[PDB]
Design a binder for this molecule. Sequence first.
Ligand SMILES: *[C@@H]1O[C@H](CO)[C@@H](O[C@@H]2O[C@H](CO)[C@@H](O)[C@H](O)[C@H]2NC(C)=O)[C@H](O)[C@H]1NC(C)=O
Ligand SMILES: *[C@@H]1O[C@H](CO)[C@@H](O[C@@H]2O[C@H](CO)[C@@H](O)[C@H](O)[C@H]2NC(C)=O)[C@H](O)[C@H]1NC(C)=O
Ligand SMILES: *[C@@H]1O[C@H](CO)[C@@H](O[C@@H]2O[C@H](CO)[C@@H](O)[C@H](O)[C@H]2NC(C)=O)[C@H](O)[C@H]1NC(C)=O
Ligand SMILES: *[C@@H]1O[C@H](CO)[C@@H](O)[C@H](O)[C@H]1NC(C)=O
Ligand SMILES: *[C@@H]1O[C@H](CO)[C@@H](O)[C@H](O)[C@H]1NC(C)=O
Ligand SMILES: *[C@@H]1O[C@H](CO)[C@@H](O)[C@H](O)[C@H]1NC(C)=O
Ligand SMILES: *[C@@H]1O[C@H](CO)[C@@H](O)[C@H](O)[C@H]1NC(C)=O
Ligand SMILES: *[C@@H]1O[C@H](CO)[C@@H](O)[C@H](O)[C@H]1NC(C)=O
Ligand SMILES: *[C@@H]1O[C@H](CO)[C@@H](O)[C@H](O)[C@H]1NC(C)=O
Ligand SMILES: *[C@@H]1O[C@H](CO)[C@@H](O)[C@H](O)[C@H]1NC(C)=O
Ligand SMILES: *[C@@H]1O[C@H](CO)[C@@H](O)[C@H](O)[C@H]1NC(C)=O
Ligand SMILES: *[C@@H]1O[C@H](CO)[C@@H](O)[C@H](O)[C@H]1NC(C)=O
Ligand code: NA
Ligand code: NA
Ligand code: NA
Ligand code: NA
Lengths: 121, 122, 122, 168, 172, 168, 318, 319, 318
Amino acid sequence: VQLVESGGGLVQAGGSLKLSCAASGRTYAMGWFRQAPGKEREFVAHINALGTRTYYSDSVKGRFTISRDNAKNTEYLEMNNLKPEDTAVYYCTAQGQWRAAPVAVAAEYEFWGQGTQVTVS
Amino acid sequence: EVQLVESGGGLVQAGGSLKLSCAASGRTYAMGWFRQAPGKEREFVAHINALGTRTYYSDSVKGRFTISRDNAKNTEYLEMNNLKPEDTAVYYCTAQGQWRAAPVAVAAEYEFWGQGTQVTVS
Amino acid sequence: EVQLVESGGGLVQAGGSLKLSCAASGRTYAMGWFRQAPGKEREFVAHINALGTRTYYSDSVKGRFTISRDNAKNTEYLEMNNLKPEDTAVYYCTAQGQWRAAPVAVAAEYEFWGQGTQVTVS
Amino acid sequence: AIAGFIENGWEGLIDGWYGFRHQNAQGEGTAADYKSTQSAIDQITGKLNRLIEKTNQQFELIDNEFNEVEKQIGNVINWTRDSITEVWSYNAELLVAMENQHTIDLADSEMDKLYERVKRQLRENAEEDGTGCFEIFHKCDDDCMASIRNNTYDHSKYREEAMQNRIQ
Amino acid sequence: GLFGAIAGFIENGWEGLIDGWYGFRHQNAQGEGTAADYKSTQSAIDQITGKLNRLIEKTNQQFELIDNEFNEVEKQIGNVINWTRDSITEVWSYNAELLVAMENQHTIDLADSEMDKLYERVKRQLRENAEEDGTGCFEIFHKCDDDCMASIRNNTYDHSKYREEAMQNRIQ
Amino acid sequence: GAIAGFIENGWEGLIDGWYGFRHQNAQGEGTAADYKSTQSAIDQITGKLNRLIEKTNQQFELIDNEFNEVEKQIGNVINWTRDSITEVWSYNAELLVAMENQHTIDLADSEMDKLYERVKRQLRENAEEDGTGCFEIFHKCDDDCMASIRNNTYDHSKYREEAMQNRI
Amino acid sequence: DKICLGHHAVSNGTKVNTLTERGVEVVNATETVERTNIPRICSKGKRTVDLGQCGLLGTITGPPQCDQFLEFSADLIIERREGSDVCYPGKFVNEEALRQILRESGGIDKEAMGFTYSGIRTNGATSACRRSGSSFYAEMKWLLSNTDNAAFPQMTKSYKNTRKSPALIVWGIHHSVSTAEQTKLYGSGNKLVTVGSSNYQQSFVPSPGARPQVNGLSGRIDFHWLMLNPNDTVTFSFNGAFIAPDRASFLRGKSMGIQSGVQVDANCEGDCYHSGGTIISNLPFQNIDSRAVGKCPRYVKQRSLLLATGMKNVPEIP
Amino acid sequence: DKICLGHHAVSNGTKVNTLTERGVEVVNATETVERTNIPRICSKGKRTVDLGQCGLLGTITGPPQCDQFLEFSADLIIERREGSDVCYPGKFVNEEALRQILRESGGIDKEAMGFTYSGIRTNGATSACRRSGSSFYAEMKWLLSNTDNAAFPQMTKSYKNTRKSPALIVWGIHHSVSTAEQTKLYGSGNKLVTVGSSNYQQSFVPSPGARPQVNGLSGRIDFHWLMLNPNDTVTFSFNGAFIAPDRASFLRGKSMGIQSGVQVDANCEGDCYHSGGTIISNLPFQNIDSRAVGKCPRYVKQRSLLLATGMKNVPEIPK
Amino acid sequence: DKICLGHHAVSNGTKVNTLTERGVEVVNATETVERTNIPRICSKGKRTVDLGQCGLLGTITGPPQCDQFLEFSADLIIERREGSDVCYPGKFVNEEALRQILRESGGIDKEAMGFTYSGIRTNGATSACRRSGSSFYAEMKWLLSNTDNAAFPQMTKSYKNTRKSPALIVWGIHHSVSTAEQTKLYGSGNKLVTVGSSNYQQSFVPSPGARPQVNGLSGRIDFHWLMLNPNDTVTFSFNGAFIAPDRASFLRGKSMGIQSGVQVDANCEGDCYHSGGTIISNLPFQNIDSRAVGKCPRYVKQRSLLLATGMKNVPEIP
Ligand SMILES: *[C@@H]1O[C@H](CO)[C@@H](O[C@@H]2O[C@H](CO)[C@@H](O)[C@H](O)[C@H]2NC(C)=O)[C@H](O)[C@H]1NC(C)=O
Ligand SMILES: *[C@@H]1O[C@H](CO)[C@@H](O[C@@H]2O[C@H](CO)[C@@H](O)[C@H](O)[C@H]2NC(C)=O)[C@H](O)[C@H]1NC(C)=O
Ligand SMILES: *[C@@H]1O[C@H](CO)[C@@H](O[C@@H]2O[C@H](CO)[C@@H](O)[C@H](O)[C@H]2NC(C)=O)[C@H](O)[C@H]1NC(C)=O
Ligand SMILES: *[C@@H]1O[C@H](CO)[C@@H](O)[C@H](O)[C@H]1NC(C)=O
Ligand SMILES: *[C@@H]1O[C@H](CO)[C@@H](O)[C@H](O)[C@H]1NC(C)=O
Ligand SMILES: *[C@@H]1O[C@H](CO)[C@@H](O)[C@H](O)[C@H]1NC(C)=O
Ligand SMILES: *[C@@H]1O[C@H](CO)[C@@H](O)[C@H](O)[C@H]1NC(C)=O
Ligand SMILES: *[C@@H]1O[C@H](CO)[C@@H](O)[C@H](O)[C@H]1NC(C)=O
Ligand SMILES: *[C@@H]1O[C@H](CO)[C@@H](O)[C@H](O)[C@H]1NC(C)=O
Ligand SMILES: *[C@@H]1O[C@H](CO)[C@@H](O)[C@H](O)[C@H]1NC(C)=O
Ligand SMILES: *[C@@H]1O[C@H](CO)[C@@H](O)[C@H](O)[C@H]1NC(C)=O
Ligand SMILES: *[C@@H]1O[C@H](CO)[C@@H](O)[C@H](O)[C@H]1NC(C)=O
Ligand code: NA
Ligand code: NA
Ligand code: NA
Ligand code: NA
């Protein structure tokens, strides 16, 4: 399975952005991680296989919205009210099978995108 | 709205028994009894739920007092056996006006109060 | 009272095996085995419930011993494989007289005890 | 059209936690069930009684806000207190989470018990529509409905009429 | 109520059941009888015994004296010790009360769960030959004698044998 | 080539889900996973795992010394305090895991029951329970009919008349 | 025709946390963590002493700011930040241990020790302890030679505790700013003070030397103390530089002590105190002050923990 | 024809507490909080020493009441209220820390330190330590001048620990009633004792002064101690007022120490002790003594916490 | 004809423990107790100082092994077993309290105290402190008489703390091997050193005597310290045997101190440390080291506590 990020760019503080992840193949639970320079990969959002439940980081909750369309086999991350601490390389992730695991752990995802840069200022 | 009127208080001998009654006018659900000794705070005594299927008591009163009710007569009862000098106080009947889940021993959880009836144990 | 009689104890070489049996007279439910090495306290070994559907073992004994029962013969069994010198002790069969939920490893929870049979491992 | 607990809750149900809603020739009506309401409330009241019980253990000062105590004994105290705070914070979080899970479960159990009770009084006179309702296969008027609510409904009285309607 | 009437577990225990925790009580032409069910009884006891095995055990961690009954230690260190000890007592007193209440809640629920499972098993084998009377009993719509009753208890009852007899009895 | 449900045993061949359907008809045998029930059980366990991974933000510093031992009295107080705390957390950890495991097992077999009861309700009077966790359908249900049961679009009134004749 | 079973619901419910889910809606919930503070000290039914300018340790020696408290009785003692234990510059050794003893004392009872002196000045005074002029600690005596630079006699005083409870005994050692002043007060030569009991024996020597000026004074007084068991004797040997106790102290009963920066309130009743006020609550936990004392709810890190008091909220939808 | 399902019940059942209800009746329950005490010390399988008149610290210095314990071996040590560490009036500095060390020592093994002296008396004795006459601490030596008011020479004594475990070293400082008496025993002038090791450095000065008489004596001896690491040396420098060690102590192994006022019992076996006896119980909690030591149930405030061992008790509907 | 409901299963499952049963098989389980250790110190993003041969207290006095650390700045401080606080034999009074102060100091800033001397030797040195020859503590000065057996004058020195934060001040008392040696260095007569501040006053007399040789010296130094409040002064009065401070110390900010025997790694980042390395884990518990510091999982006695992550495993019947 291959994941491809798109929708990154420069954007102003307080503005909004929409990322999309195009998957090729069967994906189940998916999510978003991010990495700022010299820092570790950080959990952002998670959506389950059916899209019935969502999870968010505490620093991110209330501002971001994760969603998916199983018909297009795509994942989305709606980022509203962006702030400078949101500047990072964003990766979409996916699990290949049914799984019960903590959503905030990067190792729990076997499929990773290449990443797309998002800069807020 | 709801009004409560106590009756049956009195002087009584140590070890003797007494029975209080509370006449309600209006719809009552969960009810209870509190008491107050001079210069002290209102103390929980007993509680009966709206249907009369379950009862609660203070530790100093358990085994000696019995609370009961008659929903047809809209009445509440407190039967006090084996009275002791520390049981001397003004007794108040209490009532809640709606279905409610709340700690029974907290006075603020009851909105309707009687005027009280004196019980003196000698 | 229920009477328990142990049999099958003896001298045996390290690594060998032995089979203990307990003949009961009277109605038994849950049964078990305890042991006592010289100068020590009675130690839990194995437990089987009234139906023989469930068994429990000591950590020092698990994997080597097997407890079983025959309700037709009113008998209990302890099959001891891979015997070690630390297994040297007087072994007691134990029994409870009624349906009961109790911790299996506690000696006081068993009211009927046998006389004991000596097991010596060289 | 009316629907039961399986699909949704009722924002219009008052004077109770659980209830009945019926549909017949006379019209639509809703009534609370006291036995089920009282049972759920009794259990939660039990939890709340446990919650407000207070310790009789008194604690005194062992350090000083104005003049700091000696550093070594001061660090032992700060470390001990912080460890205890960690323990109680965990207990508090676990207690509430544990209780809330149980409260939600017990409330759902009362719903099931109410549902099972009604299904049993109705016997072979009704069928389940899958949404938490019963389709009654005889003519049931307001008095008939009231008899079901207060548990005086006699299934043998309407059985033959209902079994005939059930077959065709 | 009626003469020789029997009732099930719903809002009713049996003070006469003696050789088990759960059981059957039947009514037929030959008469009334009561018998305990061992499998369900053993199952409930297994779960509670498992609980007790975990609960009735003390730690292998050793503690030594850090203060003195005969000659009191220095006041400041003594107050730290007393404050620490009392804090620990508060924690364990809280844990113990919560633990017992929690376990008791679970024990009562699991016991009522075994009753339901036994009830559901019987409902499953009887099939279309009986109806629930709402009190925890089954009204059987065919002739069930002591041997037939025993077949229900030991889970060898074959509904296909009595089905046609029973279904006509249910209809009229 | 007889098939049996969950009451009897588990299915070592079910691969694309935690719960599922297995049917038997003229066309043959088939097995299909149920996504909704599977997702629900996984949702509850992941939420549970999410709580476990939450980390403390409380910092602790050294209060004793590995190289040069502190004075004996304060050292014994420290060791005694720390070991007491260790007992508490060892108890909490042991209790937490045991408590959670009991709940996880219960929620899992609870999801199984809900799926079973849902199917029982849509089938209505067209089927009977065989006691092993299966339904014997008293009308002819082909692969398309079976699929309608799985995706909850099965209409009981359509096959009712055929089934009632066969049942009686 | 049709009968339905159901449960009540609300349009918007309170969010709570469970074991398997965060932020699940319930019909109603209640707080378990107390955040509400009463910015006063609730003292109803408690004998309360507000020390103010007086320091707790001052109540034993008796500087001018502590005169109305020399034999106080209390259930609740309140220390203030502006409190000071001294008038003449100095400090108590093992000070915090003594404070804890006094916070739970219930107050003190003073009894005369019966020391008499002859051929000596007992009226030593200073401008630091000003009571309409130069004075000294009310419970202490500053012993001097009759005339300047005159030799101070060798003395020995003993006191036996004939009461049933232990006696708090306090004495002082004077550290003069220079050798010249020490000579002026006590005469020339080495000065030695010995204090002895059944379980205590120690010596003290004044150390003349320059210190930074506090209250214009570079001298220091060292206060020392012991607990004299019943039927025990304390012996004082000195040839100068000794601040002698005049009265011993006895603990009255039981009390609790607090430190606070807010006013006292006789109208409210409470049992849980901190520096910011009183915590009155039925809730099992609080997030106000981790150092609260008395009979208190337990401190927790979380500000809010909502307990469900109703069923799960499932909105009605057409 | 009818078949019914049911469960057993009893006329009167035990009341227990749950999460949602207080005092609900169950068919059976068992206690989880131990209140039953065995009013003896259960010592089976344990080498037990009952110190009696001897104080624990006394076994190190050796007053007459501690002679039979100078090299004791034990698994369990029992302190008594009548125990005394001293004969000549005095006290140990950092006494409780040392007691804690000795309670888990397993007993002590004494070795001579090999100090020899010249130009001084080593035979200092007193009637306070009466051992068939005027004597002294069995493990100590009271060093004096040859004659009254004679000069005490400046001395240096050293000891090397050549064993593998640490050595307990104890010395004493003598506090005379007066400067005059001190001069009589050790000669005139200031008296200084300095004690040094690799990780220990302290000095001591006697404080002559009038004290209340204890058994007619106003003098005091204060004992001090250190732990000497293996292959390390302790050096004593002194010109008087010094009570010198004759033997050093070594800890044997592991033991438990308790304080009690009750009898020993070699026939019962236990692991949890308090001053009132032994707690022998399988229960997880106890309400007997919060200061119980050993391997114990946890102390709780509650006297009783009943755990249900049976189902809910439901009375039978009247026939 | 027939439709069945079922759940998945595995041939061999993991055994876990529940409230009512030991060793029940589930489809899957995960560990909750961390046993996996990183045998290195993960310091990425932390200013790290590895003291090595230098002892933490050495950074204040300045022995030769501590020259590169006299004014260090750090977020994370690492002590090593081979660390030594001294070159010339001696010890700190209240040493561990000082170490705790320094571990959280954030490093130290040194300021000259401006002490000048006349008619005395300030160049006291020893072969123990090898710094291109015989030397002494870099931040201290060994004060001596000009010539042997000459009287050491009576001197008084003061230093005022004019910064906003408290000042760490350290001095030493020299204990010579013999009375003769003390006289040779500082002259005959009684030796007294008095140190005074607003809240501190103590006196010291040297105790000449033989001690075991450490680094070839039988003499000893007693190091003492105080915390000097802003705008306060410390006064030193002494007639000999005095090791004078040359510079005062100031705490920079905030830091954490650890003790370790393993290597540093600037490439990995961690928050939980012990002597054996770094604990990097998402698990709530650990069984590695009960004395771990930082932000750590809670220590427990058990090695393994398996948490079920799947349903009960019920094998299929043939
Ligand atoms: C402290 O001393 C007092 C008085 O010397 C003791 O009280 C005496 O006790 C004896 C013994 O019973 C009586 O015969 C006397 O009549 C008591 N006299 C007085 C004045 O009370 C007291 O027992 C001693 N206490 C201690 C602990 O030594
Ligand atoms: C509950 O279990 C206890 C066992 O702990 C039973 O205790 C027995 O009580 C009877 C008297 O009722 C005694 O004759 C037995 O000796 C006791 N057994 C033991 C092992 O001590 C108790 O009877 C049980 N209660 C019920 C109602 O079954
Ligand atoms: C015991 O201590 C002695 C002296 O403290 C050690 O001997 C010294 O060893 C070093 C290095 O081997 C030599 O440079 C010294 O000359 C030795 N000194 C003496 C007096 O021999 C000895 O190594 C130590 N033994 C152990 C096992 O640690
Ligand atoms: C203990 O903590 C308080 C507040 O966090 C702090 O003011 C105090 O300095 C600490 N004590 C020590 C000895 O560091
Ligand atoms: C139950 O409802 C019916 C219908 O109104 C009524 O006739 C009957 O009296 C009721 N019974 C009770 C006990 O309220
Ligand atoms: C500690 O508590 C014990 C028992 O309550 C008491 O005897 C002792 O005096 C207390 N210690 C201090 C220092 O208050
Ligand atoms: C079950 O009961 C019937 C009727 O008594 C009997 O024939 C049959 O053998 C029993 N089966 C078992 C397994 O006991
Ligand atoms: C405290 O425990 C540590 C590690 O268990 C041990 O090395 C140390 O000696 C103990 N301290 C005391 C004073 O017993
Ligand atoms: C459900 O299955 C039937 C049978 O194949 C199919 O016709 C129908 O479209 C399905 N509905 C949905 C919503 O998938
Ligand atoms: C909910 O509960 C609170 C008590 O916490 C009560 O005061 C309130 O009236 C209840 N009802 C609503 C609608 O919040
Ligand atoms: C079982 O769980 C572990 C996590 O502990 C996971 O790594 C593994 O892939 C799982 N195995 C299966 C077959 O699901
Ligand atoms: C210290 O003195 C300086 C200058 O004399 C002054 O600016 C500062 O406010 C003083 N600070 C204090 C705390 O006295
Ligand atoms: Na209630
Ligand atoms: Na004070
Ligand atoms: Na160091
Ligand atoms: Na450990």
